[PDB]
């Protein structure tokens, strides 16, 4: 329901090359709008949505500076993390951070977050109150004390309540013709052979935005998600999304099943069945 601005950072160690790679991407809701890649020659923050291109040179210059500095600290940090976990230099390891703000209906911060992971495991996270940290193990406790001594939480809280929300608001207006116009799914049902005593009915939702959607199968109003195949919502490639839900039903019994679609761009729930 509420809009969000989020950034996703990935740093990976490369032992063979004796260096690391840092990749940052930025999103408004389900729409990517910037990237940074330390591996790119002369790396800069680059536009990845058309509406962000109207930002001036000061924006691209200053965003690029931020990422270059962040890239270096995440590279050095990979070295620390290997020492914390008694790891050799032979293996590759992965450090991630994500952070963002959700826009409340009053224009205030609904919820902000800042979290970190190492080799796919929660490492440290800013608590809901935006004033303290939770560390996952004895290694993360080293980081927590460093950040407490340096008062890092106050800066993260200031960013999340302030610049994050005001940036979100500026971006939503700049790209309002796409970011604030919900595209409803194009829906249909198909039938396919399955096995003895059973044909498959597949309910398609195609070309919708934003990503959140509800696809359910009902047999006389009763939810069938137990025997249902529900695929992960997937990108269309043009900024919209797709999803389907499929169910095996008895032959001749097709018309006793209904597919129900809920989407923000529909404004009224839909029912449909096999034709």
């Amino acid at each position: 329901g509420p809009h969000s601005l989020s950034y996703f950072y990935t740093a990976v160690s490369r032992p063979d090359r004796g260096d690391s790679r840092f990749i940052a991407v930025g999103y408004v809701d389900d729409t990517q709008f910037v990237r940074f890649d330390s591996d790119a020659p002369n790396p800069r923050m680059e536009p990845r949505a058309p509406w962000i291109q109207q930002e001036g040179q000061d924006y691209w210059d200053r965003e690029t500076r931020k990422q270059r500095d962040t890239s270096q600290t995440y590279r050095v940090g990979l070295k620390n993390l290997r020492g914390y976990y008694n790891q050799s230099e032979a293996g590759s390891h992965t450090y991630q951070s994500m952070y963002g703000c959700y826009l409340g209906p009053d224009g205030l911060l609904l919820r902000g977050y800042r979290q970190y992971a190492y080799d796919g495991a929660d490492y440290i996270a800013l608590n809901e109150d935006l004033r303290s940290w939770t560390a996952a193990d004895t290694a993360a406790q080293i980081t927590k004390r460093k950040w407490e001594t340096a008062n890092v939480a106050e800066r993260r809280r200031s960013y999340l309540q302030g610049l994050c929300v005001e940036s979100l608001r500026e971006y939503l207006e700049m790209g309002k013709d796409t970011l604030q116009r919900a595209e409803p799914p194009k829906t249909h049902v198909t039938r396919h052979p399955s096995s003895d005593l059973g044909v498959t009915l597949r309910c398609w939702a195609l070309g919708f935005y934003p990503k959140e959607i509800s696809l359910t199968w009902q047999r006389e109003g009763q939810d069938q998600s137990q025997d249902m195949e529900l695929v992960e919502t997937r990108p269309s490639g043009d900024g919209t999304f797709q999803k389907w839900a499929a169910l095996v039903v008895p032959p001749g019994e097709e018309q006793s099943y209904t597919c129900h679609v809920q989407h923000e761009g529909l404004q009224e729930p839909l029912t449909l069945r096999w034709d």
């Binding site: 950034y7 923050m45 965003e63 931020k66 990422q67 800042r114 490492y123 960013y159 994050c164 940036s167």
Partner: peptide, 9 residues
């Protein structure tokens, strides 16, 4: 706009 401040594990 990205968060600026020094980020050191």
């Amino acid at each position: 706009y990205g968060d600026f401040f020094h980020d050191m594990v």
